[PDB]
A paper describes a structure:
During viral replication of EV68, the viral genome is translated into a single, large polyprotein comprised of structural and non-structural proteins. The viral polyprotein needs to be cleaved into individual proteins for viral replication to proceed. The 3C protease cleaves eight sites in the polyprotein with a preference for a glutamine–glycine (QG) motif at the P1/P1′ positions. The conserved essential function in viral replication makes the 3C protease a promising target for DAA development.
Superposition of these two structures, experimental and computational, revealed a very good agreement with the converged modeled substrate peptide position, and the peptide from the experimental crystal structure fits well within the substrate envelope. At the same time, Thr142 is positioned closer to the P1 glutamine, enabling the Thr142 hydroxyl to form a hydrogen bond with the incoming substrate peptide. Proximal to the structural water, we observed a 4.3 Å conformational change of Arg143 to form a hydrogen bond with Gly166 that is unique to the substrate-bound structure forming the S1 pocket. Compared to the apo protease, loop 125–129 retained its overall shape but was closer to the P3 and P4 region of the substrate in the bound structure. Similarly, Gly128 was 1.3 Å closer to the P4 backbone nitrogen in the substrate-bound structure, facilitating another hydrogen bond interaction.
Numbering used by the authors:
A (entry chain C): 385 to 390
B (entry chain A): 0 to 180
C (entry chain B): 1 to 181
Write the structure that this text describes.
Amino acid sequence: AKVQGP
Amino acid sequence: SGPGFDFAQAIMKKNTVIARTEKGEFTMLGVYDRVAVIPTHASVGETIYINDVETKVLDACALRDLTDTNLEITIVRLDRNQKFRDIRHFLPRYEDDYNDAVLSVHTSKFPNMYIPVGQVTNYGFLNLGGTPTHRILMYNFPTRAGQAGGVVTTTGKVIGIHVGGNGAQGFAAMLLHSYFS
Amino acid sequence: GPGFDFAQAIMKKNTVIARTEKGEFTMLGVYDRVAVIPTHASVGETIYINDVETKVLDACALRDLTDTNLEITIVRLDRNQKFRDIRHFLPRYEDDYNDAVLSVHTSKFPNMYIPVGQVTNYGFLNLGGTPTHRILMYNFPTRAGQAGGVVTTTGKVIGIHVGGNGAQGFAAMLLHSYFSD
């Protein structure tokens, strides 16, 4: 998984 | 079902603001008083824009568990006059799986987004962008960047906030009542 | 928001859950007892409308002047309720759009509202081996079960979802001339 912020 | 969609709408209308940090816009969930949460990778600073209003960060705490492992939840105390409706009684008390969950996001990029993500399953571990993270929930929906901070709910339960994905699945950090005792 | 409030009004007042031998579809009522559904639904002599078997008075799979498929099937339903006339919300000509919302409502995707943003007049598209015209294209990771979803913008109902290819979604245009006069 990868952080999905802006 | 309408109850779930209605509950999500209520949570978004009364207990969410658009938080903007140096990293961009995030969906921010207000829990009680002047306390709110945001994914830790948002890099909260001394100031944060709350619906385009510069707000002083009275305090911030990046949550980690007994093993000193990242939980990806940052609790923030905001210098505001408005007080969040206390929703701590909607927070689960322990780790669990859920059905018919909804992911709700509100930013300038994703205004008023509501996604029925279906079954939600808890895992003790996730390698989130290289950072070991614990107390994770997974759902089978292709979430995308800009949805971090999005609120995960079932009818009467606010169970987590979105933190990441892998292209086919989404992952949320879990909200527990004991975090806001 | 402006898009969400309009989209929800169209969903609540002018959509039903249609079920054919191919499964559940979002179906948009346009006026009188006339509704639209993606042609790949393979409509028949009867159809379930919100779980009530309904006689299909007429069904016409639309084609353009070049005799090319448009992937829209107009259906006249033998039901007591009459759809609110929304034909004045339909575009008059082919165009591109911004700030679009895809709204779906089925047992699998209940109360789903997705801001897809930019919508491009793609035009030609080979949809599963079937040449198709007047296709709108938006960037959204589609999933099976969203066919028939309504695509709206600020005050217009511009098309219905007909398919996708993992990262892009495709809708058939709705034009005022299809239902007018």
